[model samples]
Target chain A: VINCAFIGFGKSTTRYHLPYVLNRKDSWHVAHIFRRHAKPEEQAPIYSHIHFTSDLDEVLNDPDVKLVVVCTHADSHFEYAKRALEAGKNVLVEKPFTPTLAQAKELFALAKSKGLTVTPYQNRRFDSCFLTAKKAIESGKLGEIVEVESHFDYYRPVAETKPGLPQDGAFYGLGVHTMDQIISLFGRPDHVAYDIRSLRNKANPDDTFEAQLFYGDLKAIVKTSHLVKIDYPKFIVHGKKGSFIKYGIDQQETSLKANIMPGEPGFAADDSVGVLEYVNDEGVTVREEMKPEMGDYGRVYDALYQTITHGAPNYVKESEVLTNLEILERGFEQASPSTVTLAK
Target chain B: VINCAFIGFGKSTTRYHLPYVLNRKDSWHVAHIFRRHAKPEEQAPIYSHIHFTSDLDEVLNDPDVKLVVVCTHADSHFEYAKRALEAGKNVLVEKPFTPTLAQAKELFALAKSKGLTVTPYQNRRFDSCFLTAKKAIESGKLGEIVEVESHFDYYRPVAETKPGLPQDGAFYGLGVHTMDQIISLFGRPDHVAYDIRSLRNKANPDDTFEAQLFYGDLKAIVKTSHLVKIDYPKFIVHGKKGSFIKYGIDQQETSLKANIMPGEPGFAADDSVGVLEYVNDEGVTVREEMKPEMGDYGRVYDALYQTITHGAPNYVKESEVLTNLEILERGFEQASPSTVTLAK
Candidate 1:
């Protein structure tokens, strides 16, 4: 079993990291956690077995720690992950892998030199919506895929920001989830065209963006914003023989946020499903509603498990992280100036 | 009253031009029609009052014909419209005003020199879908509009080609309609990013395209395709405070093809409408279903009439045509090579 140490104790750790690790008890365990202040013994009974300390050396000096999962803000991911890798421990860096691809490349090169493994924690690849789409495309029901459109939108008429939130804008925050999903499906695209904007008054960075990834003749459009109220289809794919359109986002994060344990009966179950349409032999349009597969963020932990024990390659590899960060950087670089102004 | 002459008898004449002109009986009359050969008297009773000629000189020579509608193929629009303007006749050219903006500019310059009027027949501006969207935006129900999406899609599994069809592909044909509508809504944009494509096996020009027009703080996306089986929203707009979405296409063309008179009870009345959603005074989301305004292609004709009789400016002005054509040419220039191959 792998003994994992989490660097920061935030919502990402409590809601996403801990539960997935707890669900995969057969192969993993959270041995320690680092927080700015230690909790009183009676105030943290649930995490009683886990050692808590503010000092980084307490976790880094322990020889029993096989892996370090950096669950801190995005800006410090490279720094914390580099330290973990340097300590001769396997690393799982949080999303928005690093502020830039250059930093990610440095971590990967450092890991290589130390003969250690470092992978980005892109858990959305295991999302039910993404899994279902992968299965449908692999089924060959959609023929040669020509177009794919994905959206991760939220409606917030007012501008709101939190202090010390790393990579605070939409591209750096939610964009990481959607872009990682696309790159996982279609390896590095040939070209990217971006339109990033800030609709909030006094909003720094951007609150909305659209990135068009072109692969040969195939076009994949990824979009997200904070002003969408109506529900647009979450996933849409058009192919030579037919098309697939799926509405609603994945359910894992919502279920986890509601305190639903991953092993529970209704955990990760989604009510909204997708519809797949294809041409039949008689030239008639045939449509099939697809039930989503159970979303298991635990699968990410499983990959992490295999990587540490058997030296199995991570599902989310260094190259994929590099490519995702590169696309994000280029997307922001080529984005047009913000045009929409939001009221304060 | 304005006496108008038809430059060529084709689908644009019998289906589109003649019907609209006939609808406004008080303001317009078909003085003469030019065709390669005259039809038999037995099969032409409906058009008995209209003169059919084999020579263009017959139509151009008539001084009473104050307006000349160029309803022929796109390639010849420039030549015929130029000839009509030189003859001191007001001209209304069909969509895709000309094969190129160079020709459109030349015609506009000629019209100015002769002190005559030449305008594009972009009737979609009066379509029910467009009219409803215009009303919603004008009402201030949707705050400062930030995004606008317009689509014209069709399902044709097989690629079909016809001879002498100017701007033969989807980008040139249907694209002209959608792009013209967008340009009419927002004057020439500051920047444009295009993704024009050919999804059909042997489609020469392009069967699908998307052009993103960027204004200071606004973005208008116009898209069209010949391979869509499912119906997508015809128009979608997002603003700082709210959004408007409309489904279904304009019904004028369908009604015209069915031989329904424009003044008939259900001629341009579309059952499908739009939805407007915004925040209430208390900051709660409010959604209202909207009934579409009656579509009137007759408005376009009336504009042409005013320009000819009162020397009023053409509604679809020379500047709009130049901008539309320039945008179209650049869209194609910036399009990537088609990567999707058709099964056939």
Candidate 2:
């Protein structure tokens, strides 16, 4: 087992990462978690088994730490990731890989020159709803995809003091995963139409957004709003022959927050399965609940394991990484929408 | 009986207006129709019972003709309505009251000055779907409305050569009724964000559109497209307490296209009704099909009769009429969508 360290002792590292990593005990080991500040007194006894430190040297001196997971805020992602790579450790960084695409490119080249692997943690790929949608598209039951909508709405009406970069908003916060989900399904869009807004807080960082990715006649819409009181289907996809409507979001995040590990009996199960409507052989329309794919975000770690230990290619494509960043950047830069009026 | 002359013999007149007027035979009389050109040869036999003529003076010279129904295209609505009012006749103009709000205001003032009544023929207010929605909102079962969507989607992918003014697109054709429906319920919006596009046709007139009307926390979303293969709810409204989802467009137009009159059996009947979901006092969520309001286009004629003879208030409010036109005017003028970005 190769030792891996964490740059943050926040919930992301404790819940999101360690739960998945700890399940595969034979493949990875926890070396240490380095935070800028000291560990909390109340939480000290809980994670006393793992090394928690304020200095970076504990991870740098450990040769067995083949990977360093950077779970800090996006502002410090570049610094922690670059330092981890300098220690000759492979890196797994939480999303918005860095503030800018240029920084993302710099980190990638630095890793490539050092013969070390670096990848973004896109856990939503292992989500049950997304997996079902991907399979539904691949199964051709829905026929040629015409429109797909990904919505992550919440009832958050109030805004707090900012703890993010200037570019931080729903587009970068939630959209990174939602848009990446679309990009992974249907590569890069020929063009993107953005409707970004701050519905509640009139300040920096968009709170609500709709990014329409156009690929010929196919439009994959990604939208998120904090002020949504009534929630809609998490995913809505329409094709030539049928439609697939999914209700619930992946429950792994919720499970992890409760300290439930992936292998535990009630890990990522939910009633939020999807329904597929299509014409049967008898020429009658039939709707059936699609078999829910068991969500195991540990699958991300499995890929990370294969890539690091077995030299396997990444599950998340390189182009998807670039495409995801491009959409996020353009959504902000080209926030102004375009109007194609009738020519008279 | 008060004699009324039709200025156009198109579908709007024969199918939409005549069936309703002919039903109230005791109240309205069919005066000679005044068209710019000769009647078509094939349809001539069917409408032969009604005096179809090409001379404008036939109706204007007759003092017995108390009302002139201006069924001409939007471009000529102002002209024909102006002429009818000058002839001392009350006028009923088909939707898209005029090319511009100024023209609409000018005609209203002109009719007022001449002591003649003029009103827009907004038949959609009498539609079953809209009437049901109106009652649902009024019932307070659906608490304060948070989000509402109005969709008038069709599968007509091909674009015909322009027989319209520059603003003669879906916004003017369909939105007049849809926006009027919203304005009738919510008065004027604080702001409107437009997403107008030309998907199939790269030229004048947007084929696809979305106009988001912001009224505090209530958002009324109006969208239309020609490429929707999979249909959705016609009206989707969400309130603090419940949601109202209605499927199917009003069937009056479909019935009329087949020469079916409003009073005839199966004229506006359809299986398309709405469902309401709300939490009961017993803490159980109940979903039931809301009883559909019977649709009768003849209601417009009823309102006209009351206003003309009984001195009743106009069914379509003057403020709502002005607000509808303002939204249509600004939807084109301020076609560009506004993005209220995060203030940082």
Candidate 3:
């Protein structure tokens, strides 16, 4: 069994990583967790076999720790992940993976030189809504996809700032996941156009944005807004033959927050199924709700484990990692209430 | 009674204009019709009192014919409208008034110099769907509109060309009305972004287009697509307080095609009422179906009659007429699968 250690005992570690690591006792073991402020007794009874410490060196110095999951603030991600990789452990960093593509590239190169893997947590890839959209496109039921719109909107009319919350807004926070989902589906766009706005307050960071990634005839529009009291379809896909429209988001995050671990009876069972419509062989339109693909964020670890142990392919591709960073950085560099059009 | 003559006996002349003009026999008298094809007896029985002629000069030569409704091709709108204005007759030209702002302005200037009216038929401003959306915005239920999306999507996957159908496609055919709706709501935009596309037939004219008119923080996006099988909200308005969403287009055209004239019981009645969601006085969120506004295309003539007979203001503003042409022409000039960002 591979021995695993977490860099920060934050919600990401306690919620997303530990339950899955604890489940697969046959292939994994929780060796240690390093928290700066020191809460050693936290969740001690349930995770009785685990050890918690305030020192980062104490966790990294242990040669027995085969994997290091960096579950800290995004600002500290590069340093802790770099230290863990230096100690020859495979590293898994959180989203907005190190802010800059250069920093992310350095870690990738470092991990490569050491013969260790560095994978970002792209857990949204396993979301029920995303998986369902992927299935619809692959089914050819929707024919050659012409247009796809993926939206993550909320009705937060009043804007406020939180301490741990992002100062730069959703593009850095939620956009990392939403944009990655698009990149995962359509490799890299031929061109991207951005319309980022600060609708709520001019002084505050952007509360709304629309990024259109164009691949020849196919256009994928990903947007987020703070003032949307009414919701549009979460995913609106149109193809040459027919169309597929889906409403609502994946419920996995909600489930996880409620202490419903993955593989539990009701865990990740989403009711927000997508509607698919296509012309069948007999020339009649067939429309029905396609079964939802169960969301499993733990599968990120599953794929990572498979890669580290059995020499399998990484869950997230090398190109996706680089391209995702390209979009994030390029989007900000060519920012706008005015649109920024960039060509590859 | 005001004397009227039609420059064409095409579908637009017979369907949209004639229905309203025929209803107001006390106010309007159909003096003559100029149709090149010379199908005199087509709708002759119902319109038995009217005179039909093959020569355009016959309609323009009559000094008693005070209002000339130029319901011909957009190509001929300038020629016919200029001729009628020079003949001292008030002119009501069909949409896409004169293809260019220069020509439209010339018509306005010519009509002003001659003391005759050059009115463009902007009947969509009175569409039930549009009127209700206007009502909702005026009510302040949806406070300070931040974003509004107007869509005119149709499911015509197999692309084919028709003789009378616009070779330049929907932006001219449908977008003239849709974009005008936005201009009517929010006068002139500070900036405009264009994403004109040809999704169906790239070699042919553009079948899809999206024009975003940005009024400071508020954005009005008007889009049209021929490939949409499933429909989005016809009008999606989001404000600081709440939102309003409506489905389905106005039924005036359908009713006119079915021979139901305006003011008849079932004429222009539509089921597509909008949904309004806003906070009540007590700070509780209230959601309900906004009362449907009665569709009235005849109001164009009402305003035209008032303007012509009593010198009241024209129903379609001079700036609106000018701005509508600006978007249509500018959209094509700055056309794209590539986006065009322009400042007013």
Candidate 4:
């Protein structure tokens, strides 16, 4: 069995990462979970049947633990993951892998020299909206794409959430999510610009994000904001053959959170999640291909296992993580208060 | 009869203006028409009795022709209209009264000094969509408006007939139409920004338009394109009471083009144009509204007549036209290439 230790057993650790570890039948076990407080101890809900501690060194020093999951906020992801990798342990990091691209690149290089693996937990790739979008594009229905717009917007008035604001927060937190999606499809666009702002009635860095990326002649815009509660066309992909529009976010996370079993009847088929329409030449329109696949967050864990046991490359490689960080830096560079354009 | 000369007897003049004059029963009588180098012999389809000519000087020298209509390309609108106004004749110019705000203002002042009425023919304000949006907002359905989005978009491929890409033409053609609706409802917006571009392949200047108007915390956006083809939720108004979403443009033009007579069986009640849904306080949505009123483009024409003859001020005044022009000019200025916000 591959023993694992959680270096930061906070909310993301319990909600996203630990559930997969605790629910698995075999080949994995949580050897230790490190938390500085007991409130989350009450919040975790499930018992790990192992050691729990308030000290990071105790978990790092565990001989039985083969991997360390770093689930802290973005500000500490790089340093914590670097320490784990230096201790000759594989590391699974939450997003915004580093504050800077240079730090992420150095961490990757350092991990390689130490013969350890560092995997970025970019979970949004498995989001239902994204997966369906990827599938819809792959389906060749939206042909020779001209413009693609992706949005992760909300109507959270300034009062609901303020910690997610920019500087130490929002931009790094959610910007990384959108950046990863753009990089995945276009593979580092030619040009990038952003009109990022905080419309939360207060002077925080930025809570609203609107970014434009240019891939030669093709343009993709990714936008997200919390100011307006109004409806927005979730994703609009315009191409030569036709255009495809999906109206909401991924349903898998919602499905998973509701404790619905995967492969269960209508587990991932929440009608409210999204809808896709394709129109053919004869003026015939069909909502024939509309559902996003249910995601198993277990994929990351599986890859982590394979990487340690068989020396295989991780699914989320260092290069991709670095690219995500680079995009964050580029986005921040372009996210001035002024209106931004991607074209010359 | 008030003797008048027609500058160009193209479709716009024949379909829009002539019908208004002829329907008035001898209020306006056409004296001469300028058709450039080509011979102007055929009677106007609407004003069948008016004479046509190919000489501007002939119309200019005619002492009886007291008024002139400067109907030409957007680029030449100011020059022709200015000449007619300075030549001691009243003028009724077409939409996009001039290319820039400076030209329009200069001509407006000259017309004022000369005691002539320089009216702009902004016909789309009478369009079913704007009429409906205006009525709904005024009726307290969309109370204390938070955001408004009005779109005049269509899908057309790249070709010579496409008219300088979509942007080369006035979004102001649509803008002069849409923005006037906003200025009519609420006098002046404090701040406005526009994301206008020629996104169509090898298109002209500023075909697609996205203009944002900020009034206190309320925000309004007007979008138009020749590139969008399929379904678009056209008029979206969100207020303190509720929201109103309009699907299609008014029926008069489409029905008129489709050969449906002004007074025909089931002509007004197609029953398909209105599709509204309202959500009440208990969070229950009910289909309480969504009905189209009998649309008549003649009302706007009558308003112009009242302003001209009965001494009623035109609802679409020269001042409002000036405001829209400034909004468009400032938007383009802000969107210029040199206005860059480099990431720090």
Among all candidates shown, the one with the greatest lDDT: 3
Docking outcome class, model 4: acceptable
Q: What is the TM-score of each candidate against the true structure?
A: 0.93, 0.81, 0.95, 0.83
Per-residue lDDT of model 3, residues B147-244, tens digit only:
99999988888787543333357778788888889998899887676776777765577788777888878989999888887888889999998999
Model 3 / residue A87 / CA error / Å: 1.8
Highest-scoring model, TM-score: 3
DockQ of each: 0.29, 0.21, 0.62, 0.24
Q: lDDT tens digits, residues A177-234, model 1?
A: 8988888888878777778877765446678888788877788889988888676788
Model 2 chain B: lowest-lDDT 10 consecutive positions: B335-344
lDDT of 4 at A182: 71
**Comparison by DockQ, 2 against 3, better one:** 3
How would you encode candidate 1's per-residue C-alpha lDDT over B43-70 as one tens digit per residue?
A: 5555767888888998899989998988
Docking class of 1: acceptable
Q: Write the per-residue lDDT of candidate 4 for residues A183-261, one digit (tens) a residue.
A: 7887666555545555554445666665666675566778766644455676777665566677777665666688764
The lowest-lDDT stretch of 10 consecutive residues in candidate 4 chain B is B335-344
Give a tens-digit lDDT track for model 4, residues B1-344. 56778898776665556555665555667778787654342632644666677778778878787778877777677888988877888777887687777888898899889876787776666766667777777776434566677777776535353545332554666777778777767766766655555555444566666666666556666777665545577687766545677777776666545645455554434444543444456655555555665566556556655655676877577777787777766665543321221111
Better of 1 and 3 by TM-score: 3
Chain A TM-scores for all candidates read 0.92, 0.92, 0.93, 0.85
lDDT of model number 2: 0.77
